[PDB]
Curated annotation (Swiss-Prot), chain A:
Statement: the UniProt record of this protein carries the keyword Acetylation: yes
A single Gene Ontology CC term: cytoplasm
EC number(s) reported in the record: 3.4.19.5, 3.5.1.1
Record's keyword annotation contains Protease: yes
Protein name as annotated: Isoaspartyl peptidase/L-asparaginase
Conditions for induction: By 5-alpha-di-hydrotestosterone and progesterone.
Subunit structure comment from the entry: Heterodimer of an alpha and beta chain produced by autocleavage. This heterodimer may then dimerize in turn, giving rise to a heterotetramer.
Lineage of origin: Eukaryota, Metazoa, Chordata, Craniata, Vertebrata
Gene Ontology MF annotations: asparaginase activity; beta-aspartyl-peptidase activity
UniProtKB/Swiss-Prot annotation, chain B:
Subunit structure: Heterodimer of an alpha and beta chain produced by autocleavage. This heterodimer may then dimerize in turn, giving rise to a heterotetramer.
Tissues expressing the protein: Expressed in brain, kidney, testis and tissues of the gastrointestinal tract. Present in sperm (at protein level). Over-expressed in uterine, mammary, prostatic and ovarian carcinoma.
Positions of modified residues (N-acetylmethionine): M2
UniProt protein name: Isoaspartyl peptidase/L-asparaginase
Lineage, top ranks: Eukaryota, Metazoa, Chordata, Craniata, Vertebrata
Main location: cytoplasm
Highest taxon of the lineage: Eukaryota
InterPro entries, per database record: ASRGL1_meta (IPR033844), Ntn_hydrolases_N (IPR029055), Peptidase_T2 (IPR000246)
Binding positions for substrate per the UniProt entry: R183, V184, G185, D186, V206, G207, H208, G209
Length: 293, 293
């Protein structure tokens, strides 16, 4: 049987504040830490990525749950998905407000309904039906997010894991893009676009311009290139160069193949990431390693 | 310049009488004739797929626009998408309500917004700004579907090649009978509902929505075409894999950039048609080409 791994990442932000580099890396490393503490315990590939994105949703620095950006009405609208690479089970939600963890709501769609995708008003009904609390949105909205929005009229988070049984998964959540149209939906909740997980290949999650990612099927494509024997890195660079030259898009990828191989590559300015593997945290090409206490 | 081709299909409903069948037959002819017509004025594949689709929507015998099946709460909530092979531009809607023509709203999302995908309330506000007529919730409701919901409680598409080498797909549905509210199928998940890329081809899928999502069929079929399977063999394997991995039946239509087109299926039925060379094609097996009337 195999050694687990978790990779996580978020959408790159271009140039940022020193204490923000600092707080983002801390939020990344906590997400990895949380994910691998589920794997080190015998948790599944799914529980690891569910737990790891919940971390990123709950942390106000990240555009996902609390910290999600405001739409063109100044309201939080949120998408997410998660997928079981064993059998292709998956769950997704689009256009949701007033809940803390859509990644958690996306898990219940997969497991508790004979469906993969709920949206908007309908997603709230299952939310309420499932004892998912209701919050005032003002606790997702930051003042910073109010600010950014005003100035507009003048990224995502994700996780992949391979668990002790060789099972893989991905999870992804986002508040989208500042000033998006009411009910705009991007890559996250669309399987193969934002993510895809498969025990015959591997697991990808993606960040960057949602429209560019969905038009190219950026995660499934990534998994297509490994399906013809490219290495996880040759694949990743092949798919991101295609989104760049074909639809002018940029972004990042984290992949772990069915053998434990992995990489973090982005065609954008930067991309926040950390990974966890063989008791070591990998951070980041300034990738640097430490022990997992 | 290319001999233009348009193909239409609807999902099967298993064996049906003749009284239903000829209706279903006429419908495939009309939408395929609308689409052929448009390509005869040398119009675009994006134009043609749209029109074929609009026609099935208006035809109450098909499960899209007027005469969509019902969700669990007694009502119609519709899904649609459109894609252009030229530069992969897309537009899609999901769980849109009380309008006649979901597919046109998809193309409006394509052409007049920065995004590619809007849902529920944002799709509704958007369409209202386009002056899409909000139409009565019960003109969209037919009485045969009332029974289908009442019994139970106790997709269509087109692909096209124009005379300038472009490909395109569109699709439309009311979903699955008795679906949870807000349930989003494959029809608006680019890569699953359909795919169009001028460099490879265009595809449309009917069948079990969630499975089609899971195996990402539309893009799946095209992977093989790229790798060099014929269109017939691409459907056999794309659809092969859907049956083996997720145990879902369905079927597809597909057109190559080389103008070779096929319709193939694993379900019991897939009423389809194709119009190329001043001819109509159809067949449960024994294919029947009649000159175009
Ligand atoms: Na957050
Ligand atoms: Na109809």
């Amino acid at each position: 049987h195999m050694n687990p791994i978790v990779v996580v990442h978020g959408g790159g932000a271009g140039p940022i504040s020193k204490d923000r580099k600092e707080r983002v890396h801390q939020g990344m490393v906590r997400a990895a830490t949380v994910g691998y503490g589920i794997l080190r315990e015998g948790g599944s590939a799914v529980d690891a990525v569910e737990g790891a994105v919940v971390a990123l949703e709950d942390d106000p620095e990240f555009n996902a749950g609390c910290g999600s950006v405001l739409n063109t009405n100044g309201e939080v609208e949120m998408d997410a998905s998660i997928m079981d690479g064993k059998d292709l089970s998956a769950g997704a939600v689009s256009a949701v407000q007033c809940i803390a963890n859509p990644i958690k709501l996306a898990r219940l769609v997969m497991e508790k309904t004979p469906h993969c995708f709920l949206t908007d008003q309908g997603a709230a009904q299952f939310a309420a039906a499932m004892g998912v609390p209701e919050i005032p949105g003002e606790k997702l909205v930051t003042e910073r997010n109010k600010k950014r929005l005003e100035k507009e009229k003048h990224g995502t988070v994700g996780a992949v894991a391979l668990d002790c049984k060789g099972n893989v998964a991905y999870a992804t959540s986002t508040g989208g893009i500042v000033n998006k149209m009411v009910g705009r939906v991007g890559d996250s909740p669309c399987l193969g676009a934002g993510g895809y997980a498969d025990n015959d290949i591997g697991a990808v999650s993606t960040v960057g311009h949602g429209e560019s990612i969905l038009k190219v099927n950026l995660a499934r494509l990534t998994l297509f290139h490994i399906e013809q024997g490219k290495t996880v890195e040759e694949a990743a660079d092949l798919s991101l160069g295609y989104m760049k030259s074909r639809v002018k898009g940029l972004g990042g990828l984290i992949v772990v193949s069915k053998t434990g191989d992995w990489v973090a590559k982005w065609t954008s300015t930067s991309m926040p990431w950390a990974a966890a593997k063989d008791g070591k945290l990998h951070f980041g090409d300034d990738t640097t390693i430490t022990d997992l206490p």
